[PDB]
Design a protein around this nucleic acid. Structure first.
Lengths: 48, 143, 63, 141, 206, 70
RNA sequence: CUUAAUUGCGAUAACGAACGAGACCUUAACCUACUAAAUAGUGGUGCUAGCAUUUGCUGGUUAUCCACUUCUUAGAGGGACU
RNA sequence: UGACGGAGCCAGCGAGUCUAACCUUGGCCGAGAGGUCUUGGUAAUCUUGUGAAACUCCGUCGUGCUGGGGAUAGAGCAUUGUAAUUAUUGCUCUUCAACGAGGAAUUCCUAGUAAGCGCAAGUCAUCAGCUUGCGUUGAUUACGUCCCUGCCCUUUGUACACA
C-alpha cells in the first residue's frame, strides 16, 4: 500500500513467476524432506 | 524506674562507666601492661599505650553475673583471634590466659569479685549494693 | 519511540534450540491486526500489558 | 490474671515458651528490655502486632519469655511470634472474635510467615563433594 | 496525640509516627503511590516495609514471581568473591546509609523517586541471544515485564565493585550519585551506556 | 611529601571555606585532593565533633555522612 | 497426546497380566489431645539478698515442700488426599 | 561491605577412662606453649550453655607487593613417644618474599538448596592444608533445548557377529 502508492497504474500485476525443477536421486535427500520411507507405506501418489 | 539488674546496655554503658574507673587511682596491674598482644593471633600491640584493663570493670564483671558461676577460659573466650597460620584454616584461637587469671587476683580486693563454690567466681553483695547502683548511676547519668 | 502499548494476548509457546526464546502474541488490543510476529525474552505469566517501540517489523523463526 | 497458656515461639532456632500473663505490659527476655536483642537493626521487624492496629495493647497483657539454644534468626520472628501468640490466642478465648478480627487491620495484613509454622528445614549433606549440593570437579586422563 | 506512658522502657519516637500513618522516624515510607506506569501489581511497594528482613517460599513457581520483596531482592544482589557472598546481614545498614545520602544530597524523602527506579532503568526492548550463526547475533524479540526486575536490580548494583574495590573508596557514596544519575539523564554513567548494547541492535536491525 | 602527610597548614580549614559546590568529605572522596591521608585526614576532620556544617546522624566508623548541612 | 516415568487416556489381533520403576517408606517437621515427668524443660517462689518502692522484678537456694506436662523426648494415630 | 583494637555473642554431631588414665570446667604458677592439686562423667550426670570462627556495634590503619599476604631459611622454649635426626606438632622472636583476578586447555550446581564460614567424627600417643557429617548466616536466573557431548525408541542400509 506504500510500496506501490509510488506505482501509478496501481499495483499492475500481482506479479508471479513460474519455475519447473529437476532434482536427482542423489541430491534430493540432502535438501528435500523425505530421506527414507519404510517398507509397506510406499504406496500413495497424492502429496497430502 | 524500678531499675533491675538487666536494664543495662552494652556499649554506651561501658563508654561512661568503665572510663570512670580510669581515675580512681586504680593501678592494680601486674606490671605487664603494654607488653602483651592480648591475642596469640594478634600482630600489633594494643591501643592506648597505658592501661585499658579498665574495660574489665564494666565488660567482665558485668558479664559474670549475667550468668551465675564463671571460670576464666570462658572469659578468655571473648578475645578471639585467628592467627594466619601459613596456608591453613584460621582455627579457634584465644589470647594468653595470664591476664584474666591475674585480674582474678587484682579486682578481687574491692569486694566485687568474691570466692565461690559451684565453680570459680560469683558476684558478691557489693554487686547488689554498688553494681546495682551503678546501674542506678550510669543509666541514671545517661537518661 | 512510537509506543505500541503491547499486551500478552495468548500463550503461544516456545522456540529456541538452546531453549531461550518463549513465544507470545504482542499488540495493543485497540487497533489489532498490525503486529510483529514476535515473542518475549524470559519470564512472563499470563495476560498483561507491555511497553515497546516497534509496531510491525517481523521475523519468523528464531533459533 | 495468670493462667499461663503454654504458647511458644518456635522456628528454626528457638524452643521457647511464652507465659503471656495479664499485667501492665512489661517485657523481659529473662531480664531484657526491647532495646537489647542483638542485631541493633533487625529489632525493627518486631513492629507488626503492636503499634499498627492499636496504640496501647498493654494493660490487657504481660510478657516474660525465655529463649535457649539455636542461632541468629530466631531473635526476630520467634521472639515476635511468642509475644504475638499471647494477643490473638488470648483475645479469642476470652475476648470475642469480631472484637479481634474487625480490629485485625494489621495483625494479618503483614503476616510475613509469623504464626504459620516454618517449613524451611535442614537436609543432610551428600557424599562426593564439598557441600549439600556442591560436588567436586572431575578430570580425565 | 496523648501517647501511652509506662514504666518499662519504651521510648517516644516510635509511637508518634506509625500508630496512624505508615512511615519511619526520619525516613519516608509514606503516601507515595506508584508514580511509574505498569509493572504495577509486580512490586513490593504496596506493601512497603520498614526495615529489611522478609524471606519465604519464592523458589520456582513461575506464576507467582512478583509478590516477594524487591526490597529483599535488592539487598543480596551484590555479594560475591568468597567473603561478601553469604554473610547477608551487612548491607542492612547501607540502606540505612545510602537512603540518607540521597536524603541529604537533594533529599527527595527517599520513597518518592526510588519506587520510580523503573523510570530510567526500565528498558524498552531487549536484544536476544538468538542463534543465527556467524556474527554477534542479537536479532531480537520484544521486551518482557519481569526482565525489568532482574536486569534492573543487577546492572545498577554490580557496578559497586568495579568502582570501589582494589582501592580505598567505599560502597555507599556511588550508590547515591549513580542512583540519581540512573534516575535522570546521564551521558557519563554506568547504567545507560550498558543499557546500550542490549538496545543498539534493537533498532539498527529489526 | 606528595600525598598523605599531615594537615596542609597552607590551606587547612576548607570545611569552613570550601563547602559550596562540593558537599563531599569522607574516606572515599578526599584522597585525590592532593590531601593528607585517612591515617590523619579524618582525624583532622573530627575537630568539628561538637557542631559544624558537615553533620553526621550516623555514628558509625570508617565513612560518615558529611555534606552541606546546617 | 500427557508425564518424573512403558504412567495414563485413546486407538485396537489382540485380551488379561508378573516384574522393575512407579508404588512404597523415612526425615527438619504440624498434634499445648493424650499412657507421661528434672540424669531432662516449665507460671510458681520453702529460705526470699538487692537495685526500686513505678507492689513484683534480677534472683539464687550442689533438693525445701518439689508446683506441672505443652516446650525436651514419641506408644500408636490423625491431619493432606497434586 | 577490607585489616587492627575494644563491646555483645551463636549451633548440632558426638565420643569419652576398666582395672586403666580418656574427655575435663577450675585452683595456683609462668607471656604462650603449657605444668601440679583439684570439677564432673562408662555417661540427657561432666566436657559444654561447645558464647568458637564467620557475625552485630564503637575507636586505629591508606594506591604499597601494604596494619593483604607469609612462601623461604635461623635461633630459643614446651608437648607426645623405650625411642622426634632426613626435623610429630605448637609457641616466642629472627627470614618477610612471591602473587596482583591468572594462556589454543575446562567442571559442579536451580530454596534454608545454589553460596559464606567454622566444630565433632574417621584414620587419632602425637600429625589435617583431607574426607564425611554437623551445623550458623543465605541470593540467583534459566524457568528449558538440540548445533557441540551423552543416552533410549520407530524407520530404513549393512559383505559385521572377540559386532
Amino acid at each position: 500500500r506504500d510500496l506501490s502508492e509510488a506505482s501509478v497504474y496501481p499495483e499492475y500485476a500481482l506479479p508471479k513467476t513460474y519455475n519447473k525443477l529437476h532434482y536427482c536421486v542423489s541430491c534430493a535427500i540432502h535438501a528435500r524432506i523425505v530421506r527414507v520411507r519404510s517398507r509397506e507405506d510406499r504406496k500413495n501418489r497424492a502429496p497430502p | 524506674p524500678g531499675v533491675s539488674v538487666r536494664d543495662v546496655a552494652a556499649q554506651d554503658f561501658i563508654n561512661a562507666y568503665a572510663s570512670f574507673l580510669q581515675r580512681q587511682g586504680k593501678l592494680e596491674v601486674p606490671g605487664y601492661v603494654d607488653i602483651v598482644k592480648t591475642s596469640s593471633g594478634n600482630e600489633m600491640p594494643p591501643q592506648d599505650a597505658e592501661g585499658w584493663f579498665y574495660k574489665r570493670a564494666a565488660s567482665v564483671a558485668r558479664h559474670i553475673y549475667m550468668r551465675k558461676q564463671v571460670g576464666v577460659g570462658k572469659l578468655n573466650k571473648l578475645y578471639g583471634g585467628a592467627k594466619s597460620r601459613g596456608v591453613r584454616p584460621y582455627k579457634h584461637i584465644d589470647a594468653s590466659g595470664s591476664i584474666n587469671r591475674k585480674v582474678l587476683q587484682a579486682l578481687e580486693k574491692i569486694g566485687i569479685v568474691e570466692i565461690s563454690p559451684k565453680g570459680g567466681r560469683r558476684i558478691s553483695e557489693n554487686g547488689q549494693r554498688d553494681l546495682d547502683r551503678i546501674a542506678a548511676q550510669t543509666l541514671e547519668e545517661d537518661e | 519511540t512510537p509506543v505500541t502499548l503491547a499486551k500478552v494476548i495468548k500463550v503461544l509457546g516456545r522456540t529456541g534450540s538452546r531453549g531461550g526464546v518463549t513465544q507470545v502474541r504482542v499488540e495493543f488490543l485497540e487497533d489489532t491486526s498490525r503486529t510483529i510476529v514476535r515473542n518475549v525474552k524470559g519470564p512472563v505469566r499470563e495476560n498483561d500489558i507491555l511497553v515497546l517501540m516497534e509496531s510491525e517489523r517481523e521475523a519468523r523463526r528464531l533459533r | 490474671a495468670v493462667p499461663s497458656v503454654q504458647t511458644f515461639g518456635k522456628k528454626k532456632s528457638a524452643t521457647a515458651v511464652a507465659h503471656v500473663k495479664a499485667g501492665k505490659g512489661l517485657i523481659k527476655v529473662n531480664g531484657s528490655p526491647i532495646t537489647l536483642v542483638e542485631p541493633e537493626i533487625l529489632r525493627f521487624k518486631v513492629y507488626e502486632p503492636l503499634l499498627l492496629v492499636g496504640l496501647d495493647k498493654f494493660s490487657n497483657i504481660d510478657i516474660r519469655v525465655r529463649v535457649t539454644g539455636g542461632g541468629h534468626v530466631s531473635q526476630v520472628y520467634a521472639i515476635r511470634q511468642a509475644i504475638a501468640k499471647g494477643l490473638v490466642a488470648y483475645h479469642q478465648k476470652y475476648v470475642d472474635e469480631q472484637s479481634k478480627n474487625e480490629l485485625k487491620k494489621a495483625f494479618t495484613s503483614y503476616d510475613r510467615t509469623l504464626l504459620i509454622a516454618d517449613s524451611r528445614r535442614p537436609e543432610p549433606k551428600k557424599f562426593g563433594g564439598k557441600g549439600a549440593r556442591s560436588r567436586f570437579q572431575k578430570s580425565y586422563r | 496525640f496523648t501517647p501511652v506512658v509506662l514504666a518499662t522502657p519504651i521510648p517516644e519516637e516510635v509511637q508518634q509516627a506509625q500508630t496512624e500513618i505508615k512511615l519511619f522516624n526520619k525516613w519516608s515510607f509514606e503516601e507515595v503511590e506508584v508514580k511509574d506506569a505498569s509493572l504495577v501489581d509486580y512490586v513490593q511497594v504496596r506493601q512497603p516495609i520498614f526495615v529489611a528482613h522478609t524471606a519465604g517460599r519464592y523458589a520456582n513457581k513461575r506464576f507467582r514471581k512478583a509478590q516477594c520483596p524487591i526490597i529483599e531482592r535488592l539487598t543480596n544482589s551484590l555479594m560475591m568473591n568468597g567473603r561478601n557472598n553469604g554473610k547477608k546481614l551487612k548491607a542492612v545498614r547501607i540502606i540505612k546509609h545510602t537512603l540518607d545520602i540521597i536524603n541529604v544530597l537533594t533529599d527527595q524523602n527517599p520513597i518518592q523517586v526510588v519506587v520510580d527506579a523503573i523510570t530510567n532503568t526500565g528498558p524498552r526492548e531487549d536484544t536476544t541471544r538468538v542463534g543465527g550463526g556467524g556474527a554477534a547475533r542479537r536479532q531480537a524479540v520484544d521486551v518482557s515485564p519481569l526482565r525489568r526486575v532482574n536486569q534492573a536490580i543487577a546492572l545498577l548494583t554490580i557496578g559497586a565493585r568495579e568502582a570501589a574495590f582494589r582501592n580505598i573508596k567505599t560502597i555507599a557514596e556511588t550508590l547515591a550519585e549513580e542512583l540519581i544519575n540512573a534516575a535522570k539523564g546521564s551521558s557519563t554513567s554506568y547504567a545507560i551506556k550498558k543499557k546500550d548494547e542490549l538496545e543498539r541492535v534493537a533498532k539498527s536491525n529489526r | 611529601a606528595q600525598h598523605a602527610v599531615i594537615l596542609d597548614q597552607e590551606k587547612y580549614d576548607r570545611i569552613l571555606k570550601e563547602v559550596p559546590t562540593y558537599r563531599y568529605v569522607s574516606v572515599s572522596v578526599l584522597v585525590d585532593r592532593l590531601k593528607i591521608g585517612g591515617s590523619l585526614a579524618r582525624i583532622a576532620l573530627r575537630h568539628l565533633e561538637k557542631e559544624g556544617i558537615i553533620k553526621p546522624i550516623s555514628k558509625h566508623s570508617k565513612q560518615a555522612i558529611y555534606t552541606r548541612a546546617t
